[PDB]
């Protein structure tokens, strides 16, 4: 039980992430409302076996968000500043618009590209070997939405849900090459992910509490599924099961579509502290880690729901075909 309260008693967890280079390493970001404390902005690092408090941190009075790590291995750290700028730090070392999203594009030959979606929608991208990083390199793409999801197999293509109620798609060759919109349910979508399995399946979730299986091969979505709290964070589970999860108000609603229908497979309120914030599952153990709106951290383990091990694994492509069948049924 590692319930971290380093300072963050008056902070609010904005993001939680894990490290592939160190599978036992996790980095969290929070935003503070009380300035009468240690410092401003947040990036905290710690391992699973290390002391509850964050082992390593970065100290400054700079509010920092849009955090991501070097793609090959944890050697460089990138952050998208609140004023549209971008900063990069050597890990092996001691604008009228904010940036919304950030991503590394791994080019193994050299440094790895940087893409930042701003709060207006427009996308920027660049990379430079000198990391003291100079934003002089830059490219701009005419982008309308805020959270841009990229195509796992073909990283140049991307999509987004816009406030106008559509879901735009395009790619890196031209920002205007392919400017149609996904219209599965045609709602103001603010979240997108991709099924981390065989297909080119992605998901997009709207302000109207609607979740949408964008199969890249289709213009009409597969399973127009539907549930309160779909504005907020969604995720594909790091299991063979295509498990879905939404989480607000110290409450998580969980879907295991691999064993049951689109009704919620589990739901859990948490009394540790109110208003759960960002979460993290690791593939290794079901020690699920979560933050709270009070800035604290916690974790629990429910191993019986780990895996079903027969239907999730090779029947999952059949399950996606079955979802397309459910579309033919909708028709």
């Amino acid at each position: 039980y590692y319930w971290s309260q380093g300072d963050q008693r008056k902070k609010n967890v904005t993001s939680i992430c894990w490290n592939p280079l160190y599978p036992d390493l996790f980095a969290v970001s929070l935003g503070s409302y009380d300035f009468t404390k240690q410092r401003m902005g947040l990036i905290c690092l710690y391992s699973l076996k290390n002391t509850t408090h964050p082992e390593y941190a970065f100290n400054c009075e700079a509010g920092v968000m849009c955090l991501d790590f070097h793609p090959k291995s944890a050697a460089l750290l990138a952050v998208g500043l609140y004023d549209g700028t971008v900063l990069v730090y050597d890990i092996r070392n001691k604008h009228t618009d904010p940036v919304w999203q950030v991503k590394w594009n791994p080019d193994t030959s050299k440094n790895y590209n940087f893409y930042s979606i701003s709060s207006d929608g427009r996308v920027m991208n660049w990379i430079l070997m000198k990391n003291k990083n100079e934003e002089e390199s830059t490219l701009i793409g005419l982008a309308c939405g805020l959270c841009f999801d990229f195509n796992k197999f073909e990283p140049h293509i991307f999509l987004v849900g816009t406030e106008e109620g559509k879901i735009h798609k395009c790619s890196r060759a031209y920002s205007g090459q392919y400017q149609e919109t996904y219209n599965g349910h045609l709602l103001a979508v603010y979240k997108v992910k991709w099924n981390n399995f065989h297909p080119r399946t992605f998901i997009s979730a709207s302000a109207d509490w609607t979740v949408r299986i964008w199969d890249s091969k289709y213009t009409s979505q597969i399973i127009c599924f539907d549930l309160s709290m779909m504005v907020v964070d969604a995720v594909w589970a790091p299991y063979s099961s295509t498990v879905f999860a939404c989480a607000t108000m110290d409450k998580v609603q969980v879907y295991d579509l691999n064993v049951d229908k689109l009704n919620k497979l589990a739901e859990q309120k948490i009394v540790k502290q109110p208003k759960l914030t960002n979460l993290s599952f690791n593939y290794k153990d079901p020690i699920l880690l979560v933050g709270d709106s009070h800035g604290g951290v916690t974790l629990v383990k429910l191993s019986p729901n780990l895996c079903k091990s027969g239907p999730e694994i090779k029947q999952t492509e059949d399950k996606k075909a079955m979802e397309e069948f459910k579309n033919v049924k909708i028709e």
Partner: peptide
């Protein structure tokens, strides 16, 4: 019952 929301129940109504 497929949903906890009226409007998704209405989606199923539209399915019918």
């Amino acid at each position: 019952n497929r949903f906890r929301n009226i409007e998704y129940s209405l989606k199923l109504l539209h399915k019918f």
